[PDB]
Design an enzyme around this catalytic site. Sequence first.
Site: not given
Length: 240
Positions: A45, A59, A61, A64, A69, A93, A186, A188-189
Site C-alpha cells: 500500500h 537515516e 533524523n 538533519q 545517510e 500487503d 508513516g 507502514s512498511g
Amino acid sequence: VVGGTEAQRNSWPSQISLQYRSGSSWAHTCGGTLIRQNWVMTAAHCVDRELTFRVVVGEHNLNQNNGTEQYVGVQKIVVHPYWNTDDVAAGYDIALLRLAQSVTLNSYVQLGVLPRAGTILANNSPCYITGWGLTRTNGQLAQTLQQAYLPTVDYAICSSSSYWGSTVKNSMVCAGGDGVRSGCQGDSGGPLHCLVNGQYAVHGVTSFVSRLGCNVTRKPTVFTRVSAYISWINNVIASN
Ligand code: NA
C-alpha cells in the site's frame, strides 16, 4: 509510532525511509527494511501511488544531516501479485523494491534478518516497532527514529470479536493493543523486530491500524507476517 521513545542511532540499522519527490524536496512516506544491498521490503500500500521514490538508509533524523545517510533511487517495484489496494484486510500487503545502486554496509546500514519460513510468535512475544510515523493520532511525523515495545497478540486473540474479528488473517501478525503504544501513519512498511533466540529478526511489515485511531485498546497494529512470504521474496530476488 505512538508512545515510542527515541531509538539509539545504531540500534536498527536495517530500517529505511521510503521518500517521494514532493516539488523541490523529498518527503517521508513510509518505512521499510533493507534485505539485500540492492533490495528493500516494504508494504504494497506504500507504493500504490504513481510517485517518484527514493530510499534512504542510515537515516536517524529526517530533518538533519546525521552524516551517515546514503540516498538511492528505486529502479523497480515488485508488488505482491495478489495485492488489491481497496482490500488491505485480504492481505498480501508486501512489496519489494530494487535499488538503483547497492548500498554500502556499516554500523548504521545492515541487512534485516528475516525469520525462517512458517515461524509464528508465541502470544506476548517481545517486539519493537520502529519508524518515523505520526507520534499521535492525527499528529505529525517524528523527527528522529522512534521505537515502541509492542508485545505480540496471537491470532486466536486478535481474530476474536472484541479485537479485529475476521479482518485479521493468519498471514498477519498483531502487536500492541494497550491503548498507549502503536504504529501510526508513516510507519507502514516498516519493520516489527522481535527477539527470538537472542537475535532480533524482522517478523512484520507494518500494514494497518484502526480507522478509530492508531492507539486503540484491543485494536493492535497489524503487520504482514514476513515468515509467510519467504518463498515469494526469494523468488522475486532470484528472478530479478
Ligand atoms: Na538525516
